[PDB]
Amino acid sequence: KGFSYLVTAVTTVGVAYAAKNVVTQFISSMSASADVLAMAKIEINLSDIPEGKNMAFKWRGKPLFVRHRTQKEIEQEAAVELSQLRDPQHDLDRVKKPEWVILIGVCTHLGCVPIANAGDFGGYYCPCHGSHYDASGRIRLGPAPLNLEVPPYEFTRDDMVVVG
Amino acid sequence: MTRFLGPRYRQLVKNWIPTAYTWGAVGTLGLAWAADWRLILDWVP
Amino acid sequence: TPMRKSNPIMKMINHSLIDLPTPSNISMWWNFGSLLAFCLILQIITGLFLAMHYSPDTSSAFSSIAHITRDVNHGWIIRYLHANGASMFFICLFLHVGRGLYYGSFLLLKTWNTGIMLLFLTMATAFMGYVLPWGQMSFWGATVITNLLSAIPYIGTDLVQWIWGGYSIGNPTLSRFFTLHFILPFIITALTMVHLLFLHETGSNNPCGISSDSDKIPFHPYYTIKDILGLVLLLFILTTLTLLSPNLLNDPDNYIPADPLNTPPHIKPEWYFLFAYAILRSVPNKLGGVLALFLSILILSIIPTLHNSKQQSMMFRPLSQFLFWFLITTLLTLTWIGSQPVSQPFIFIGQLASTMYFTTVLILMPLTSLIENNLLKW
Amino acid sequence: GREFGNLTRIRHVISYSLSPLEQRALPHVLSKGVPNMLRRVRESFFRVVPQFVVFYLLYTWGTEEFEKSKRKNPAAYENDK
Amino acid sequence: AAVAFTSKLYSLLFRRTSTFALTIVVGVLFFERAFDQGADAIYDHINEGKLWKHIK
Amino acid sequence: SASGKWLDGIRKWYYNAAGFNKLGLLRDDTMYEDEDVKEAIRRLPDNLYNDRMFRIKRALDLNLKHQILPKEQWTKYEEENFYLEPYLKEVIRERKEREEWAKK
Numbered sequence: 066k067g068f069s070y071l072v073t074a075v076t077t078v079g080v081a082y083a084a085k086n087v088v089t090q091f092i093s094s095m096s097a098s099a100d101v102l103a104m105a106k107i108e109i110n111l112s113d114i115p116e117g118k119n120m121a122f123k124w125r126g127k128p129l130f131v132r133h134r135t136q137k138e139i140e141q142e143a144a145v146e147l148s149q150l151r152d153p154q155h156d157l158d159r160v161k162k163p164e165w166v167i168l169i170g171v172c173t174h175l176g177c178v179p180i181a182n183a184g185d186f187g188g189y190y191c192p193c194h195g196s197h198y199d200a201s202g203r204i205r206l207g208p209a210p211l212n213l214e215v216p217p218y219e220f221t222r223d224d225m226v227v228v229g
Numbered sequence: 230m231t232r233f234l235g236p237r238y239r240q241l242v243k244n245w246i247p248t249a250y251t252w253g254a255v256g257t258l259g260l261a262w263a264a265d266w267r268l269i270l271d272w273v274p
Numbered sequence: 275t276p277m278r279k280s281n282p283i284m285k286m287i288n289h290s291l292i293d294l295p296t297p298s299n300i301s302m303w304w305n306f307g308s309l310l311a312f313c314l315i316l317q318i319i320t321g322l323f324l325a326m327h328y329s330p331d332t333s334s335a336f337s338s339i340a341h342i343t344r345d346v347n348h349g350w351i352i353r354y355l356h357a358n359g360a361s362m363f364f365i366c367l368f369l370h371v372g373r374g375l376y377y378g379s380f381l382l383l384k385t386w387n388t389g390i391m392l393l394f395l396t397m398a399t400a401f402m403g404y405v406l407p408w409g410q411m412s413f414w415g416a417t418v419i420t421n422l423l424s425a426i427p428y429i430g431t432d433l434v435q436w437i438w439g440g441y442s443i444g445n446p447t448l449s450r451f452f453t454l455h456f457i458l459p460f461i462i463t464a465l466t467m468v469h470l471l472f473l474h475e476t477g478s479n480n481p482c483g484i485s486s487d488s489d490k491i492p493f494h495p496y497y498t499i500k501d502i503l504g505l506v507l508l509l510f511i512l513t514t515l516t517l518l519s520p521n522l523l524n525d526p527d528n529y530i531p532a533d534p535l536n537t538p539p540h541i542k543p544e545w546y547f548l549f550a551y552a553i554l555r556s557v558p559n560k561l562g563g564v565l566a567l568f569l570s571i572l573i574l575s576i577i578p579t580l581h582n583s584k585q586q587s588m589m590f591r592p593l594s595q596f597l598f599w600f601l602i603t604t605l606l607t608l609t610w611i612g613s614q615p616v617s618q619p620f621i622f623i624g625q626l627a628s629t630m631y632f633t634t635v636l637i638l639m640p641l642t643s644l645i646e647n648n649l650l651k652w
Numbered sequence: 653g654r655e656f657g658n659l660t661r662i663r664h665v666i667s668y669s670l671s672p673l674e675q676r677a678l679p680h681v682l683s684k685g686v687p688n689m690l691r692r693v694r695e696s697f698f699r700v701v702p703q704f705v706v707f708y709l710l711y712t713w714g715t716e717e718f719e720k721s722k723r724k725n726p727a728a729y730e731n732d733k
Numbered sequence: 734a735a736v737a738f739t740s741k742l743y744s745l746l747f748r749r750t751s752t753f754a755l756t757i758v759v760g761v762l763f764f765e766r767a768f769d770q771g772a773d774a775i776y777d778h779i780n781e782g783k784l785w786k787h788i789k
Numbered sequence: 790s791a792s793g794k795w796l797d798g799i800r801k802w803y804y805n806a807a808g809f810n811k812l813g814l815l816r817d818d819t820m821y822e823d824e825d826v827k828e829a830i831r832r833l834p835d836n837l838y839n840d841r842m843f844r845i846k847r848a849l850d851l852n853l854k855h856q857i858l859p860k861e862q863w864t865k866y867e868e869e870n871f872y873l874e875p876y877l878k879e880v881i882r883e884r885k886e887r888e889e890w891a892k893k
């Protein structure tokens with residue numbers, strides 16, 4: 066009995082190997098193709114952005130906000146109590162220069178684009194299910210779990226910034 | 230249900246426990262082997 | 275023997291819809307299954323025609339539909355028929371479910387479970403058709419529905435990116451929507467056949483909830499002509515909707531092509547979905563919201579388990595009836611709330627409506643059934 | 653399986669029928685059918701209607717409230733300066 | 734009498750279906766890696782000097 | 790005490806609201822035929838079985854004709870017959886006994 070069952074065991078082992086390989090390559094057919102995965106950088110000229118203006122740029126398929134904040138906004142964003150936040154963070158943890166803030170304009174709940182200068186908090190409002198953000202991009206009301214994402218950047222001129 | 234509280238059912242469950250955890254081992258290791266799940270497979274020598 | 279009974283294919287047809295024994299006393303509420311089948315057939319035909327002119331590419335989808343409605347001979351009415359047939363399909367579906375909740379036909383377990391499967395499939399199909407025009411509403415609908423799987427804690431984001439085929443919604447996703455929308459209706463067809471196979475092993479329940487084997491009549495000629503009458507009525511309504519008032523259910527924001535950089539200020543899905551949307555809007559937590567969204571439909575599967583009554587139908591059970599109609603009004607309320615901005619009155623009203631929906635299905639009906647039993651002294 | 657030969661067991665029931673061509677299709681509408689419909693409406697009125705009335709009141713209230721909320725409050729400018 | 738190899742193999746592993754299945758998954762885990770490595774070695778060896786991995 | 794008259798009052802109200810009496814039907818006619826109920830129906834003597842069958846057919850015919858009996862012929866709350874209850878209680882006892890044997 067042992068010998069006859071050993072044969073079956075070995076056969077099954079080989080069949081399992083072949084099946085794994087076939088199924089997995091079929092599955093990897095549906096992942097991103099080798100012409101979709103480009104990742105470029107983007108350069109923004111800041112002297113075309115007035116004070117109080119939120120500009121949106123297309124980057125890697127999604128909006129990129131650049132906001133030129135006024136002085137009272139810089140002041141009132143610092144007053145916030147970090148204990149009353151679901152994703153606590155200070156403003157200076159989120160900007161390199163106080164009068165500029167750069168964000169990825171995608172809502173952290175289910176992906177809609179927040180409208181600027183709307184909501185209860187002077188920041189952004191998302192119409193899809195009702196989440197409010199402040200001018201630091203911090204989540205203040207509604208179902209979203211996280212703050213708006215900050216990309217890597219650096220200033221190459223006092224009027225030029227590169228996001229990459 | 231309330232029917233299945235009693236001695237026979239306790240004995241009957243004890244009879245099948247080992248087979249149950251053996252099938253559990255089979256399923257777990259198979260899932261890991263199939264999805265190249267490094268969380269488990271990195272500990273295999 | 276007659277040829278009617280000479281042969282397996284013919285004898286199956288005969289057992290299905292010639293010599294089948296049907297209850298004598300079933301009412302109009304039993305016509306909506308045949309209308310559902312009719313609607314499925316209509317959709318498949320009009321879809322096969324549209325298919326031969328549509329373009330599953332984000333740089334021409336919109337304009338292909340423009341081409342269909344302006345240059346193809348009578349293409350506009352074919353478009354109109356497809357779009358209105360979907361609406362009729364869901365009207366019949368909702369009424370079909372409600373019957374069975376009222377008259378206790380969920381005690382046919384196999385039929386009920388296959389019905390739940392069919393509901394799910396039809397909803398998937400309808401949604402994946404709604405994004406094909408690539409208008410401004412279609413795009414953001416796609417976006418939300420494909421971000422839903424981000425709520426799965428360990429593997430979600432990767433699932434989202436594997437369904438997109440890239441870093442974002444784009445050309446590779448539209449062809450996926452179109453392939454799936456093409457194939458699903460036929461799976462629906464096969465499962466419908468299984469559904470009826472299961473049904474014909476027992477036969478139809480009836481309004482009184484008592485056994486009808488003393489008064490069975492044959493399906494032909496009685497219910498043949500009755501269902502033909504129902505179909506004539508449905509066609510009258512469908513034509514009036516298609517030709518006399520085509521813009522009644524139409525949405526202007528889907529006549530603006532897609533813009534990945536701007537979501538419009540006021541968001542509203544297709545009407546047969548509003549209620550789910552409201553439910554999704556009512557929970558201040560992501561995971562909890564999605565869980566509620568799916569449970570709202572999956573809860574039908576445990577209604578057979580919570581049944582306490584000695585009698586099957588609500589025909590003789592008045593307290594029960596009162597609760598039934600209250601539940602229907604809760605659903606109307608969710609539909610109305612779904613149409614409104616996310617502002618405070620509607621937020622609060624929606625939360626109450628949701629809690630009352632689940633409450634009613636899970637608690638109030640079981641308890642009223644026990645009270646009723648006690649009043650009849652058993 | 654289920655077939656008109658052996659569904660159930662019955663004894664001592666008599667039936668009588670006419671042919672369709674012997675009788676009228678709509679024999680008595682206004683002398684019998686109309687009152688019957690009326691009682692049929694009576695027997696269900698109070699089990700269905702009040703819930704919908706309550707829905708209507710809720711709808712109108714919520715609409716009115718939302719529309720009030722959008723009008724400017726004089727005390728927001730008059731109170732302090 | 735004669736504790737022989739296949740009899741021990743039957744009695745310890747193959748007698749019970751769950752354990753048979755477990756044996757199979759455990760064997761495939763190790764077969765896969767050994768087999769891949771051997772094949773890649775042979776392949777690399779057949780055409781040394783012509784693959785860009787080493788020319789790199 | 791009065792509580793008996795009060796409970797019987799609400800019970801009569803619920804009975805008239807249910808309306809199976811308008812069709813000429815008894816309460817025990819209206820049960821759903823689960824396993825135990827079918828076995829209790831198997832045990833009936835012939836006269837009760839035949840009476841039940843005719844009553845049910847008659848209700849079905851009326852329902853077909855969207856009609857009801859004359860008020861004079863409605864089933865009254867104070868003179869009804871629970872003909873099936875006894876048999877059902879025995880069936881349920883037997884099943885309970887078997888269950889209880891099955892857990893030892």
Ligand SMILES: CCCCCCCCCCCCCCCCCC(=O)OC[C@H](COP(=O)([O-])OCC(O)COP(=O)([O-])OC[C@@H](COC(=O)CCCCCCCCCCCCCCCCC)OC(=O)CCCCCCCCCCCCCCCCC)OC(=O)CCCCCCCCCCCCCCCCC
Nearest residue numbers: 301302303511514515518519689692693696697700701705
């Ligand atoms: C520009 C567009 C133009 C569009 C034109 C459209 C024209 C449509 C023509 C349609 C003709 C249909 C003919 C069918 C014949 C079939 C014969 C048959 O066998 O029937 C059996 C079938 C019943 O089946 P059954 O076997 O008895 O079983 C049913 C139940 O189980 C039985 O249970 P029960 O016995 O317990 O029930 C008794 C009672 C139960 O009663 C109750 O529950 C109580 C009801 C009380 C109501 C009280 C009044 C209202 C509430 C007020 C409350 C107080 C408010 C206080 C407020 C206070 C505020 C402070 O129910 C009834 O008796 C119901 C009878 C009436 C049915 C009405 C059907 C309406 C269809 C509408 C179609 C709309 C779409 C059209 C297309 C539009 C395209 C744009 O129907 C009938 O017997 C009735 C046939 C006649 C129906 C005529 C309908 C005409 C509709 C015309 C609409 C025109 C306007 C459209 C507006 C569109 C807006 C977008």
Ligand SMILES: CCCCCCCCCCCCCCCCCC(=O)OC[C@H](COP(=O)([O-])OCC[N+](C)(C)C)OC(=O)CCCCCCCCCCCCCCCCC
Nearest residue numbers: 070073080081084085088089259260263747748750754757
């Ligand atoms: C969801 C995706 C991931 C899923 C991963 C699955 C994990 C579990 C895998 C288990 C594999 C081994 C199971 C063996 C069960 C044998 C039972 C039996 O009856 O055996 C005796 C039978 C009959 O043997 P017999 O009749 O000679 O004698 C048996 C008698 N006893 C038991 C006493 C010895 O043998 C068979 O014929 C069994 C054939 C099994 C063939 C299985 C093929 C492999 C399929 C799974 C692997 C591929 C997965 C790919 C995933 C890809 C993901 C991207």
Ligand SMILES: CCCCCCCC/C=C/CCCCCCCC(=O)OC[C@H](COP(=O)(O)OCCN)OC(=O)CCCCCCC/C=C/CCCCCCCC
Nearest residue numbers: 275276277278279280281282283284285286287288292293
């Ligand atoms: C050239 C221009 C077009 C000309 C078209 C001419 C045809 C017009 C339409 C005619 C429709 C058919 C009418 C006659 C059907 C007769 C059926 C028959 O005899 O079979 C009945 C009998 C019933 O079965 P039982 O119940 O067992 O009977 C036992 C009785 N105690 O047999 C059957 O089971 C049915 C058999 C059906 C046969 C049907 C044959 C159809 C022929 C159609 C030809 C069309 C030609 C078109 C040509 C177009 C130009 C190239």
Ligand SMILES: CCCCCCCC/C=C/CCCCCCCC(=O)OC[C@H](COP(=O)(O)OCCN)OC(=O)CCCCCCC/C=C/CCCCCCCC
Nearest residue numbers: 303365368369371372373375376481588589602605696700
């Ligand atoms: C394009 C926009 C579409 C909007 C949505 C449309 C679908 C929803 C429509 C809601 C209103 C439906 C009203 C239907 C008529 C009601 C008439 C009425 O009350 O009559 C009561 C009369 C009483 O008869 P009996 O108790 O049998 O005894 C009489 C014999 N002696 O009939 C009934 O009670 C029959 C009730 C059958 C079920 C009706 C279901 C209606 C609503 C169904 C859809 C609701 C949404 C989905 C619900 C399920 C969700 C899980």
Ligand code: HEM
Nearest residue numbers: 304307308310311374379385386389390392393466478479
């Ligand atoms: C494409 C979708 C569906 C189709 C085509 C379909 C078709 C049918 C048809 C033709 C009948 C014959 C009897 C009748 O018309 O009432 C029927 C009965 C039935 N359907 Fe479906 N149905 C669908 C979806 C559903 C759903 C969503 C449910 C429940 C959630 C359901 C549950 C039932 C039940 C329980 C019955 C038998 C009830 C009785 O006879 O009393 N079906 N269906």
Ligand code: HEM
Nearest residue numbers: 317318321322324325328357360400403404406407456459
């Ligand atoms: C249950 C069956 C079906 C349902 C519920 C359904 C639903 C829908 C809906 C709601 C739309 C969008 C309507 C609009 O944008 O105005 C649509 C579009 C479309 N469907 Fe169907 N459909 C079904 C079957 C099919 C089938 C079988 C095909 C086969 C090819 C098909 C092909 C198409 C095409 C090409 C479009 C895009 C054309 C357009 O938007 O007008 N459909 N479908």
Ligand SMILES: O=C1C(=C2CCC(c3ccc(Cl)cc3)CC2)C(O)=C(O)c2ccccc21
Nearest residue numbers: 290291296304307308311312470478497501
């Ligand atoms: O309409 C049907 C029905 C069926 C009739 C034929 C229909 C149909 C639909 C499409 C085609 Cl191509 C042929 C027949 C499908 C539904 C069916 O099976 C029942 O059992 C039933 C029971 C009570 C009341 C109505 C029905």
Ligand SMILES: O=C1C(O)=C([C@H]2CC[C@H](c3ccc(Cl)cc3)CC2)C(=O)c2ccccc21
Nearest residue numbers: 193411414415418419541542543547550551
């Ligand atoms: O914000 C939304 C949204 O939340 C949904 C939702 C509606 C409910 C849907 C749904 C999902 C699953 C089931 Cl079982 C039923 C409905 C999912 C998409 C939309 O349909 C939509 C369409 C267009 C723009 C924005 C949106």
Ligand code: FES
Nearest residue numbers: 172174175191194
């Ligand atoms: S997508 Fe922004 S609140 Fe849901």
